[PDB]
Coordinates of C-alpha atoms in Angstrom, one line a residue:
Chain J
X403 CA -4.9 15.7 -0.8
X404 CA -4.8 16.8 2.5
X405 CA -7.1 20.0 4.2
X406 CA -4.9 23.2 5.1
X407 CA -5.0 26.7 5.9
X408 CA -4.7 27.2 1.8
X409 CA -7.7 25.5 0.6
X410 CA -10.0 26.9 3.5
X411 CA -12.7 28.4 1.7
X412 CA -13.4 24.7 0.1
X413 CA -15.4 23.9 3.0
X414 CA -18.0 26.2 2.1
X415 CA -18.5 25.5 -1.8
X416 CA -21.4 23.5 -3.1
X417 CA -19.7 20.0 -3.2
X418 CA -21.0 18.2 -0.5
X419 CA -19.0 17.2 2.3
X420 CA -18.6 16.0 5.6
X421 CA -15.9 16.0 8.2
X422 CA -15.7 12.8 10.4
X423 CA -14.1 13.1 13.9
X424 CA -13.6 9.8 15.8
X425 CA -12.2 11.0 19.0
X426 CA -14.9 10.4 20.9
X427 CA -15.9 6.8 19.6
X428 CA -14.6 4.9 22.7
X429 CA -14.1 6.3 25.7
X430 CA -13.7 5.1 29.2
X431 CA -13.0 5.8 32.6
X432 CA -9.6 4.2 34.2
X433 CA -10.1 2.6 37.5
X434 CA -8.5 0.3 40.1
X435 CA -9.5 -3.0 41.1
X436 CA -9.9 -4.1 44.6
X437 CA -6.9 -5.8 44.1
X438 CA -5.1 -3.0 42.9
X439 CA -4.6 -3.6 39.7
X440 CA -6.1 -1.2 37.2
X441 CA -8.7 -1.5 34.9
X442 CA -11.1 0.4 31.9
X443 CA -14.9 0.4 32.0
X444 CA -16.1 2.1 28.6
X445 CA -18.9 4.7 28.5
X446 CA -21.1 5.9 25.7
X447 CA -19.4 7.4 23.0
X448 CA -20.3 9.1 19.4
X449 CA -19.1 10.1 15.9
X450 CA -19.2 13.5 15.4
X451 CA -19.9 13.8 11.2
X452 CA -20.4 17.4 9.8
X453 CA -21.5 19.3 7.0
X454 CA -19.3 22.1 7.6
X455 CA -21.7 24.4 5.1
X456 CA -25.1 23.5 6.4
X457 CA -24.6 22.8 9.8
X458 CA -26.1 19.5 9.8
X459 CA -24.4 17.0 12.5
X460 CA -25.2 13.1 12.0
X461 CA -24.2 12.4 15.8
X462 CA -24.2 8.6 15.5
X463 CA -24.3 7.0 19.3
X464 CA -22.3 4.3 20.4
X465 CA -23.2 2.3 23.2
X466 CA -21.4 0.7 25.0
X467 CA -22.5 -2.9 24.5
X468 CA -20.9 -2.8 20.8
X469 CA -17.4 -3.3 22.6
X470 CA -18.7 -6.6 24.7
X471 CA -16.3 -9.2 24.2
X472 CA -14.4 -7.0 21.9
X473 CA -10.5 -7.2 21.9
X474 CA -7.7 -4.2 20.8
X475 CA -10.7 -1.6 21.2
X476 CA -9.0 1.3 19.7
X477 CA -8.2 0.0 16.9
X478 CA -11.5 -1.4 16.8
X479 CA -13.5 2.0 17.0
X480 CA -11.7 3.3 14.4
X481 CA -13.2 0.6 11.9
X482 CA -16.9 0.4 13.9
X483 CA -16.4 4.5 12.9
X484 CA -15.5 3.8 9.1
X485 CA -18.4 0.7 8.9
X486 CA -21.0 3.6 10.3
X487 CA -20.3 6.8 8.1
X488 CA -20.7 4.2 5.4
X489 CA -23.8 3.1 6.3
X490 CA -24.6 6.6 6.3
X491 CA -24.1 7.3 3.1
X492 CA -25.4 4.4 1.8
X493 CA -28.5 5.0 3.8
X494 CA -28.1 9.0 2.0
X495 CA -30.0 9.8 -1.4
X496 CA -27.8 10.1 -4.2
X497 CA -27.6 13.6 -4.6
X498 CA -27.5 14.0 -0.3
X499 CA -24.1 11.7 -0.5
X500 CA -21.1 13.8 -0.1
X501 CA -18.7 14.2 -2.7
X502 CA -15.7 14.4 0.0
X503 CA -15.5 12.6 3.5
X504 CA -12.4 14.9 5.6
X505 CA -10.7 12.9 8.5
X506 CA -9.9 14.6 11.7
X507 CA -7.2 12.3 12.2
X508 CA -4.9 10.1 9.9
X509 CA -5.8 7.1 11.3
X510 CA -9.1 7.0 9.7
X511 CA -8.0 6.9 6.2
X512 CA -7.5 3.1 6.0
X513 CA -10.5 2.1 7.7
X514 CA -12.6 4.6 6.1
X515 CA -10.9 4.1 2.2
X516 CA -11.6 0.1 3.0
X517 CA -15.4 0.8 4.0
X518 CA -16.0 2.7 0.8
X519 CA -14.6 0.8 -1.9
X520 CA -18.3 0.6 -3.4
X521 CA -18.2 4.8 -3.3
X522 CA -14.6 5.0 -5.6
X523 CA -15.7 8.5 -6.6
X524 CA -15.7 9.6 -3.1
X525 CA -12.5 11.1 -2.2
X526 CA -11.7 10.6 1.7
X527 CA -8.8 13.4 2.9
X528 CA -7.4 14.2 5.7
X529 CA -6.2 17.7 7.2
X530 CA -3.6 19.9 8.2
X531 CA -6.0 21.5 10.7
X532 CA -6.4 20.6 14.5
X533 CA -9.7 21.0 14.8
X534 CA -11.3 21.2 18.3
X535 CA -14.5 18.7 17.2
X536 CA -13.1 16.4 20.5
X537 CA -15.1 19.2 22.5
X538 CA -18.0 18.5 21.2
X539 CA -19.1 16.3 24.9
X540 CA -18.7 19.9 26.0
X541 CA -22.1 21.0 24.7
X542 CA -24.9 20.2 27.1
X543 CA -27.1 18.9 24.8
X544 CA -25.1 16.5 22.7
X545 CA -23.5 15.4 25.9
X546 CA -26.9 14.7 27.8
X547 CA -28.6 12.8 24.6
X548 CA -25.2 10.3 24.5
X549 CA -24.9 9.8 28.5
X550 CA -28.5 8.7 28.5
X551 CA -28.7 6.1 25.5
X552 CA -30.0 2.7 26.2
X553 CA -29.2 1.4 22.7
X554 CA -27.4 2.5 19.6
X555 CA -29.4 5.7 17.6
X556 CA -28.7 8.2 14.9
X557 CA -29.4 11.6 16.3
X558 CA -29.5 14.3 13.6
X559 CA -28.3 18.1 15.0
X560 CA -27.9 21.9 13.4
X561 CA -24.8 22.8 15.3
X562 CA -25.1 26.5 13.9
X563 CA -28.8 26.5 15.4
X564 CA -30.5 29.6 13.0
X565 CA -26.7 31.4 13.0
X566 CA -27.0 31.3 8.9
X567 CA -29.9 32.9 8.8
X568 CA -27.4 36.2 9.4
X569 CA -24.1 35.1 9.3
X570 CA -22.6 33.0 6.2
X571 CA -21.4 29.2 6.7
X572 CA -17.1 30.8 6.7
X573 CA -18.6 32.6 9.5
X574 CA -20.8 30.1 11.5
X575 CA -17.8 27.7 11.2
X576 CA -15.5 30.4 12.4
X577 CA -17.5 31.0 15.3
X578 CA -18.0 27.0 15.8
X579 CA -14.5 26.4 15.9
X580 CA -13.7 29.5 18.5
X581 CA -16.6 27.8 20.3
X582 CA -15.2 24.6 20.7
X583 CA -11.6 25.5 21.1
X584 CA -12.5 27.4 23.8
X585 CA -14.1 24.7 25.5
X586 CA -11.8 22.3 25.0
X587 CA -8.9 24.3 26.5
X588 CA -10.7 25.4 29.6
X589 CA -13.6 24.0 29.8
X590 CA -15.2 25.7 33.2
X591 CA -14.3 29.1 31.8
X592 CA -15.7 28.6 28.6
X593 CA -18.7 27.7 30.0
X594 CA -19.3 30.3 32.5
X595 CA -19.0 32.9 29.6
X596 CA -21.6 31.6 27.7
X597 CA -24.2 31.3 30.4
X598 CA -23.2 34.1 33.0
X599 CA -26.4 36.3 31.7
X600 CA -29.4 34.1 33.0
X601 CA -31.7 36.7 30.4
X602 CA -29.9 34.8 27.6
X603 CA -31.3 31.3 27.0
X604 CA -30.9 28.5 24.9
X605 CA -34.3 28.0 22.9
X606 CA -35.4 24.1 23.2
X607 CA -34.5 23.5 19.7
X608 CA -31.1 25.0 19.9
X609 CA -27.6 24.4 21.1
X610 CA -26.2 27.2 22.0
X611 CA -27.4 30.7 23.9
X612 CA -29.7 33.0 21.7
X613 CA -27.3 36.2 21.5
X614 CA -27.3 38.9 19.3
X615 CA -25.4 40.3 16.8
X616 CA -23.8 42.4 19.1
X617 CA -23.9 39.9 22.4
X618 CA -22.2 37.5 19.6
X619 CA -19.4 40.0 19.3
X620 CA -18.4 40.0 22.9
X621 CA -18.7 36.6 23.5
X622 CA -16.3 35.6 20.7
X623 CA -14.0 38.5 22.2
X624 CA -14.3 37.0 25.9
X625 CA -13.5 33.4 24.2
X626 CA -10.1 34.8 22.2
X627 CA -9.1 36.1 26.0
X628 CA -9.4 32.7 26.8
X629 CA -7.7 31.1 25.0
X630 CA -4.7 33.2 24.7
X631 CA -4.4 33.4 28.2
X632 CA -4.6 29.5 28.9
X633 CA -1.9 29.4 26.0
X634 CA 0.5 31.9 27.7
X635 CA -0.4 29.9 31.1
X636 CA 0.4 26.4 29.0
X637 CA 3.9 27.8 27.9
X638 CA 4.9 30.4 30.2
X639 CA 5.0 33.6 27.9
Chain V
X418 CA 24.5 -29.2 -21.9
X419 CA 23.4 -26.7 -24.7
X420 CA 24.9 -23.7 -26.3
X421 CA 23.7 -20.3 -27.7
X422 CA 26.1 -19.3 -30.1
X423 CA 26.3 -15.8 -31.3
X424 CA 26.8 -14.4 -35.1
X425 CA 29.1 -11.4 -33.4
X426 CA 29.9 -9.2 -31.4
X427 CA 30.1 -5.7 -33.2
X428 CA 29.2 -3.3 -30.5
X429 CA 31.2 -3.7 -27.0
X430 CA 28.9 -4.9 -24.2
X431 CA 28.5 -6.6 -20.8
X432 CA 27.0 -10.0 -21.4
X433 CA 25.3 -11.7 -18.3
X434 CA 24.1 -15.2 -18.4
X435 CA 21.9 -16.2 -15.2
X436 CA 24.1 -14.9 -12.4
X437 CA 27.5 -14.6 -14.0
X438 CA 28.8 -12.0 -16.7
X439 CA 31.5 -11.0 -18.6
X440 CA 32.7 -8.2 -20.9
X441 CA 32.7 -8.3 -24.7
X442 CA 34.9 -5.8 -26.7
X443 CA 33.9 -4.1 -29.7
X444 CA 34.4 -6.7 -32.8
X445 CA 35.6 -9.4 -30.5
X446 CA 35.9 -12.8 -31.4
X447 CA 33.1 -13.9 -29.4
X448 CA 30.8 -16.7 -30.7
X449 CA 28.9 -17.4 -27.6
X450 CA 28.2 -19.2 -24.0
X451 CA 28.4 -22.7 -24.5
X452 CA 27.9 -25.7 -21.1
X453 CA 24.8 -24.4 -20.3
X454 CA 22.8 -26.4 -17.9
X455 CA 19.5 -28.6 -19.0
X456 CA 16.5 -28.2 -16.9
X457 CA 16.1 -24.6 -15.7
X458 CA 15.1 -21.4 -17.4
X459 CA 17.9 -19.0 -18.0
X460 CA 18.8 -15.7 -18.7
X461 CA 20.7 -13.8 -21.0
X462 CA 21.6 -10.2 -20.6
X463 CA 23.0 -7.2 -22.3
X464 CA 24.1 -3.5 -21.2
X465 CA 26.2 -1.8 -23.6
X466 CA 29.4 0.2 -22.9
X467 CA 28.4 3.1 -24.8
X468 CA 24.7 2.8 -22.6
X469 CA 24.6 2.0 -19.1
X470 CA 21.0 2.4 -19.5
X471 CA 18.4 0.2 -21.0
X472 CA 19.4 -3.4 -19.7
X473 CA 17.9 -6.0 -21.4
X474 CA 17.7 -9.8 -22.6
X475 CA 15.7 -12.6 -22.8
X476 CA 14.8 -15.2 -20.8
X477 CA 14.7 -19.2 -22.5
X478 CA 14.8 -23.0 -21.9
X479 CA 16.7 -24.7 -24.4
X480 CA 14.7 -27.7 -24.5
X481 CA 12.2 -25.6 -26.3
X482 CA 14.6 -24.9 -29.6
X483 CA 17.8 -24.0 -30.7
X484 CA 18.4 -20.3 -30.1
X485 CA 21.1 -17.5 -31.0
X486 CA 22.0 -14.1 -30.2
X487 CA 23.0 -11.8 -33.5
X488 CA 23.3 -7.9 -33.0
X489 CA 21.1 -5.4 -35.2
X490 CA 22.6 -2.5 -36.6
X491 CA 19.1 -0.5 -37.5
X492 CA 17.3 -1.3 -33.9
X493 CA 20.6 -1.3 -32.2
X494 CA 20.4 -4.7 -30.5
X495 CA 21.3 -8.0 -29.6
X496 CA 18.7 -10.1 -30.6
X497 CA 17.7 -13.4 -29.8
X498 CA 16.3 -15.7 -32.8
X499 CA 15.6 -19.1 -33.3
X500 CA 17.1 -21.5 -35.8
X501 CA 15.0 -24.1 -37.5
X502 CA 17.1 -26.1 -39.3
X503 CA 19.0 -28.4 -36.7
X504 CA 21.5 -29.1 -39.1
X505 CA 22.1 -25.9 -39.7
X506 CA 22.7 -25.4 -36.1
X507 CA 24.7 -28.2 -34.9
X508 CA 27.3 -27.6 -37.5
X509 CA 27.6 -23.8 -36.4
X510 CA 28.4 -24.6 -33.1
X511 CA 30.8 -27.3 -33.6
X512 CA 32.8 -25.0 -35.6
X513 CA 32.6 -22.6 -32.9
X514 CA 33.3 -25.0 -30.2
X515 CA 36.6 -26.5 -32.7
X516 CA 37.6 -23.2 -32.7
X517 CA 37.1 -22.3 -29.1
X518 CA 35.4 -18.7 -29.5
X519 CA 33.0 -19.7 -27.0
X520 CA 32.7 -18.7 -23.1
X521 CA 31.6 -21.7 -20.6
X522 CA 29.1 -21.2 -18.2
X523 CA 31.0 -21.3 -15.2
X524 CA 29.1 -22.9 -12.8
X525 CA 30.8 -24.7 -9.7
X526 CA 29.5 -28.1 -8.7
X527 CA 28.5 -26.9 -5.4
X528 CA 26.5 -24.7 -6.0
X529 CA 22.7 -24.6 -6.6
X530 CA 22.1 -20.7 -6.8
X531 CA 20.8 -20.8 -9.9
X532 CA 18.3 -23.8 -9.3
X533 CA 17.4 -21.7 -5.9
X534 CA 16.8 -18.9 -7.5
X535 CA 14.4 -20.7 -10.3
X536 CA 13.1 -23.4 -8.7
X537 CA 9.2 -22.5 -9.5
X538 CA 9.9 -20.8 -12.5
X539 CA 8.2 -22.6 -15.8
X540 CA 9.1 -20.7 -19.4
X541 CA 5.1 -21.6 -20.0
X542 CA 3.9 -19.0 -17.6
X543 CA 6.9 -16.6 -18.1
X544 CA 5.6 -16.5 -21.7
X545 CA 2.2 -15.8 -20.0
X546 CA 3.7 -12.4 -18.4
X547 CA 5.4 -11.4 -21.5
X548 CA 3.4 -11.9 -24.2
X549 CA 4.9 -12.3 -27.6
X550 CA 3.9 -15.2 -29.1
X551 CA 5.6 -16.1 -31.9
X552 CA 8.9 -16.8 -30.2
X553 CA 9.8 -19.4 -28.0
X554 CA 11.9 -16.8 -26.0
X555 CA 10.8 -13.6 -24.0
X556 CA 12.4 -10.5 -24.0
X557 CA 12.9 -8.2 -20.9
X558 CA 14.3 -4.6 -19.9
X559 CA 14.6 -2.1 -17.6
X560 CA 12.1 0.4 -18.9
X561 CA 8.8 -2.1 -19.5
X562 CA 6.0 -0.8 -17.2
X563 CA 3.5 -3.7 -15.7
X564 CA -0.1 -4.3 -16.1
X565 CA -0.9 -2.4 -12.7
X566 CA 1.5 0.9 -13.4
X567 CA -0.7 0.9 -16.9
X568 CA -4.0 1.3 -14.7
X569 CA -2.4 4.0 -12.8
X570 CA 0.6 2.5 -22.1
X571 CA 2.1 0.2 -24.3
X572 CA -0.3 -2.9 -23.8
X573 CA 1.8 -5.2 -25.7
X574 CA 5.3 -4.1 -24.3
X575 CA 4.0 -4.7 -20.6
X576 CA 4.8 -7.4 -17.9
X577 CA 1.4 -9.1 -17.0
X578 CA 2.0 -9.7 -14.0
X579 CA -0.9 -10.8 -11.2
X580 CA -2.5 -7.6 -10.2
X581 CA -2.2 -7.5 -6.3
X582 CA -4.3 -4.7 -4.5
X583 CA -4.6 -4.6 -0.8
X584 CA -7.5 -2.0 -1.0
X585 CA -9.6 -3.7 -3.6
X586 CA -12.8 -5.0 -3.7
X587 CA -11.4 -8.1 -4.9
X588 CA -9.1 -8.6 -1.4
X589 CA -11.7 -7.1 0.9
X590 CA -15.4 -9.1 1.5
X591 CA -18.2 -7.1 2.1
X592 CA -18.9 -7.0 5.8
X593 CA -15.2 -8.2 6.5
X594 CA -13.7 -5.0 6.1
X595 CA -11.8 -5.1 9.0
X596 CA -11.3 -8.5 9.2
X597 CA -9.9 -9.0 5.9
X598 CA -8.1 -6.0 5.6
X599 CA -5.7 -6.8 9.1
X600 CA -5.7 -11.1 8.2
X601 CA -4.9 -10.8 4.1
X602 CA -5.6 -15.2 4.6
X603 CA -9.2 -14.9 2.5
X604 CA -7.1 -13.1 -0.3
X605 CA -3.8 -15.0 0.0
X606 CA -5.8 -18.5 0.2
X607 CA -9.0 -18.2 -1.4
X608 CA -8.7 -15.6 -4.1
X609 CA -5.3 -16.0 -5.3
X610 CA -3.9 -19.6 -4.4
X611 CA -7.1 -21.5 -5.1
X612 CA -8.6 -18.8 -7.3
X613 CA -5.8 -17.5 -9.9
X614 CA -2.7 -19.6 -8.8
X615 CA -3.9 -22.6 -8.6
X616 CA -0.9 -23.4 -6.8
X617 CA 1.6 -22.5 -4.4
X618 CA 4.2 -23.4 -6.8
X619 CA 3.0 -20.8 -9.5
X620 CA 2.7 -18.8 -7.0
X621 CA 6.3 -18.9 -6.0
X622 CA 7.7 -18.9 -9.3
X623 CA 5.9 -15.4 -10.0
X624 CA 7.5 -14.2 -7.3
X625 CA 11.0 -15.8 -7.9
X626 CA 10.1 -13.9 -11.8
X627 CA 9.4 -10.5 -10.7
X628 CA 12.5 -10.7 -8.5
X629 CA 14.8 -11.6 -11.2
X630 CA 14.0 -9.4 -13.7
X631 CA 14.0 -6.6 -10.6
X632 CA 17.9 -7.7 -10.0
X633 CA 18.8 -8.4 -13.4
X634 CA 17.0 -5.2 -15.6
X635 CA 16.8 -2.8 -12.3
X636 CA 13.0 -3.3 -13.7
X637 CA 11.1 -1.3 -11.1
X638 CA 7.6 -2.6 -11.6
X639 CA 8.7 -6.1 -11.5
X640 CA 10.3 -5.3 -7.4
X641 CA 7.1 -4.0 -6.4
X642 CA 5.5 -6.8 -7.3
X643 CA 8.0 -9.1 -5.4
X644 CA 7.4 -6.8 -2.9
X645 CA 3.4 -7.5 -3.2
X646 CA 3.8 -11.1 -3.4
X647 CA 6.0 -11.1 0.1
X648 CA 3.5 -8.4 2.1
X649 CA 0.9 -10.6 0.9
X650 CA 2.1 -13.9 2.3
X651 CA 3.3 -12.4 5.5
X652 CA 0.1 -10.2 6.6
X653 CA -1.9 -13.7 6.2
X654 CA -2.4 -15.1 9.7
X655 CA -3.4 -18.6 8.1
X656 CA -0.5 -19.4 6.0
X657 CA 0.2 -23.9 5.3
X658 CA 3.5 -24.3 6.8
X659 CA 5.1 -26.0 3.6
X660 CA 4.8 -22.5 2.1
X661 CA 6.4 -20.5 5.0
X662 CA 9.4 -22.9 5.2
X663 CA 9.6 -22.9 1.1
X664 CA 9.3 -18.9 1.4
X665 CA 12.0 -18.4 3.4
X666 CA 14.5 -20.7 1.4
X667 CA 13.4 -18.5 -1.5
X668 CA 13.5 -15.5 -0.4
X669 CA 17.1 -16.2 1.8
X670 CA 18.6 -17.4 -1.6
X671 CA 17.4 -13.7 -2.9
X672 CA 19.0 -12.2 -0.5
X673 CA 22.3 -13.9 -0.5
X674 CA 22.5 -13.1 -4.1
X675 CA 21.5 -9.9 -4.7
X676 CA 24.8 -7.1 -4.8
X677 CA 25.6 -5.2 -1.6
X678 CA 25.6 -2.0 -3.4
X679 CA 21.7 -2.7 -4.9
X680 CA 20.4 -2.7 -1.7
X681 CA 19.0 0.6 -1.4
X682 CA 16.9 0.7 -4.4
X683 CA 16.2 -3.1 -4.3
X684 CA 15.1 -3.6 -0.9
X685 CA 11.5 -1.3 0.6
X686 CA 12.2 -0.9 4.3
X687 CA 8.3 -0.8 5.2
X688 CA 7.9 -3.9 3.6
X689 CA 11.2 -6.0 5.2
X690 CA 10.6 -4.4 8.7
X691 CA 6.7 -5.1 8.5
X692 CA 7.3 -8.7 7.2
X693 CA 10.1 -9.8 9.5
X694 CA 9.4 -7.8 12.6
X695 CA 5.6 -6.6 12.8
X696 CA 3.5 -9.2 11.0
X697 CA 2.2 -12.7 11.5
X698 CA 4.9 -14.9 10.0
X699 CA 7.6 -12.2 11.7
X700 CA 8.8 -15.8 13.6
X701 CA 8.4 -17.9 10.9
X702 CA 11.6 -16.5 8.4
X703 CA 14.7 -17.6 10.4
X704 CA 17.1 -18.3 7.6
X705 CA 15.9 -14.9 5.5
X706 CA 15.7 -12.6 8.8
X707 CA 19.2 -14.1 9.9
X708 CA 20.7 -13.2 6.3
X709 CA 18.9 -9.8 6.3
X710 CA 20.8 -9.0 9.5
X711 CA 23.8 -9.8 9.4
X712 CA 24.1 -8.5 5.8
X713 CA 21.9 -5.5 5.9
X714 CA 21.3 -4.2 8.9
X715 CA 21.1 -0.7 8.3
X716 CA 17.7 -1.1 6.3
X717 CA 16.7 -2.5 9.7

């Protein structure tokens, strides 16, 4: 059944699975035509799919020419999602395939229950949780490598960089998710606390900034500020 | 016109016979239904006084055999039988029928309700859904479970219906995932009309089946398969248009039969409003959307 605050510390057993996030599958910009009426014109967009224990991110890429002469394009996107993470797992040695697949949003269950009819012992879920995985176009990196895609590609991220090398996977998905949220609810602010140090860098094989232990500590205290401010701001408390 | 006597009536019960129905008392002269029309199935039903649960009967076509209804004392039933001996059988009937201790099936010439609601249905593949072979007869109630509950115990005491499974690898093509899971025509059309069907017309008198024993036994497997049978129908975008006109005379006659009062048990709300309003064939039910209406409107 479906992911909630009571069965968090699922996530980081030794069953193998993967949160799939679809927000970011088709996106566009809304314009107007010269004759004023208005129109979309899609950009690149991506699945975000997730090991929450390893860190491993299957970013799949989708370019914009899989939507040419496409009609109902949301609704689309949603199956083009469930007809990739298949693939994927297909394309997955057995003992690599993931025992659950976790929706980010209900919509997926359909399309992605349909696309694994051949995996019946793979449950797909979805969750209570509103998890901030739509920020994920907020990090530099995974931004720049969708923006400049000329064709579709499979690009294969750690999104805790080395963090579980010190820090266990409750932890690195803790700090994730404050991450993200942050970013996703102002994203300007967020960013200028991660980077504001210029003697902090993000190595060339990593995502985010190489803090320590201790820089770790006040970042994730200048990203709680954040967001509870922006949330008294949103509702005037 | 043929008759189904009955030995007697020991235990006071509400007898139904297709449609119509009428009350029994304990040790009643009552020696049966008698004017019963040739050429259709029918149905005869039971609920007892003393057991408003468990209704049951037993669908039959007396062209097949003479057949009569005599009450068990150890499993607590009327049971239908068959009588060999035609002899034997005329001349127990034309006693009862000189001594007038038998009930007429009351049909009004006007009326073809009972033909509307049977017009597909063969006692040959009836006897395919309930399986009991050594009786010409088939015996239904409230309680049996179909095939498709069992998968999610009794194998012998089950209604074998058509399995119907939107999410299937039999109704989804590889590679048409999307396609076939938004346009059910492929599954409708190829797998189940030309593939297990044969026909349209079984097809339909499955349905009309299910529906029946759903009204008549509150049997709850046999409306979601009605159910299934209608969803399936209307989510096909590529439906021949002697089937949609048939389907909504069926389905209208369903409607206009079934008792106010069963309508919220009877009737799933996803499926009417999805069939008449959101699907493909949502323009092609007038009669059955213009009885569901004006006659249940609140489900709507």
């Amino acid at each position: 059944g479906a992911m909630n605050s009571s069965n968090y510390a699922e996530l980081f057993n030794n069953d193998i699975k993967l949160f799939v996030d679809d927000t970011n599958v088709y996106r566009v910009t809304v314009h107007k035509t010269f004759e004023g009426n208005v129109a979309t014109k899609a950009i690149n967009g991506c699945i975000f799919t997730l090991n929450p224990k390893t860190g491993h991110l299957f970013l799949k890429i989708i370019h914009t020419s899989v939507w040419a002469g496409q009609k109902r394009l949301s609704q689309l996107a949603k199956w083009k999602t469930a007809e990739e993470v298949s693939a994927l797992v297909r394309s997955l040695p057995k003992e690599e395939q993931p025992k659950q697949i976790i929706v980010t949003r209900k919509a997926m269950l359909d399309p992605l229950e349909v696309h694994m009819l051949d995996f019946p012992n793979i449950a797909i879920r979805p969750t209570e949780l509103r998890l901030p995985f739509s920020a994920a176009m907020s990090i530099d990196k995974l931004s720049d490598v969708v923006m400049k895609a000329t064709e579709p590609q499979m690009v294969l991220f750690n999104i805790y960089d080395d963090w579980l090398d010190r820090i266990s996977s409750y932890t690195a998905f803790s700090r994730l998710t404050l991450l993200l949220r942050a970013l996703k609810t102002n994203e300007e602010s967020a960013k200028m606390i991660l980077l504001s140090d210029p003697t902090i860098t993000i190595k060339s094989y990593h995502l985010w900034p190489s803090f320590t232990d201790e820089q770790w500590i006040t970042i994730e205290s200048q990203m709680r500020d954040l967001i509870l401010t922006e949330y008294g701001r949103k509702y005037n408390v | 016109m043929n008759t189904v006597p009955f030995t007697s009536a020991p235990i006071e019960v509400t007898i139904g016979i297709d449609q119509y129905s009428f009350n029994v008392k304990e040790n009643q002269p009552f020696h049966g239904i008698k004017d019963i029309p040739i050429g259709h199935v029918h149905v005869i039903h039971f609920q007892h006084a003393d057991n408003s649960s468990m209704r049951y009967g037993y669908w039959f076509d007396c062209r097949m055999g003479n057949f009569y209804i005599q009450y068990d004392p150890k499993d607590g039933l009327y049971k239908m039988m068959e009588e060999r001996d035609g002899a034997k059988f005329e001349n127990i009937v034309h006693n009862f029928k000189e001594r007038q201790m038998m009930v007429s099936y009351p049909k009004i010439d006007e009326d073809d309700t009972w033909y509307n609601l049977t017009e597909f249905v063969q006692m040959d593949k009836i006897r395919k859904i309930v399986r009991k072979d050594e009786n010409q007869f088939s015996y239904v109630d409230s309680s049996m479970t179909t095939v498709q509950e069992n998968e999610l115990s009794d194998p012998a005491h089950s209604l074998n219906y058509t399995v119907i499974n939107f999410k299937s690898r039999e109704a989804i093509r590889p590679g048409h995932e999307m396609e076939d899971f938004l346009d059910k025509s492929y599954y409708l059309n190829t797998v189940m009309l030309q593939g297990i069907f044969k026909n349209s017309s079984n097809y339909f008198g499955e349905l009309q089946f299910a529906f029946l024993n759903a009204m008549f036994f509150g049997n709850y497997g046999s409306s979601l398969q009605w159910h299934a049978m209608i969803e399936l129908i209307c989510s096909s975008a590529t439906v021949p248009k002697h089937m949609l006109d048939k389907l909504d005379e069926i389905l209208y006659y369903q409607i206009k039969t079934l008792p106010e009062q069963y309508s919220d048990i009877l009737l799933n709300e996803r499926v009417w409003n999805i069939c008449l309003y959101s699907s493909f064939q949502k323009n092609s039910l007038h009669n059955t959307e213009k009885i569901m209406e004006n006659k249940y409107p609140e489900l709507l």
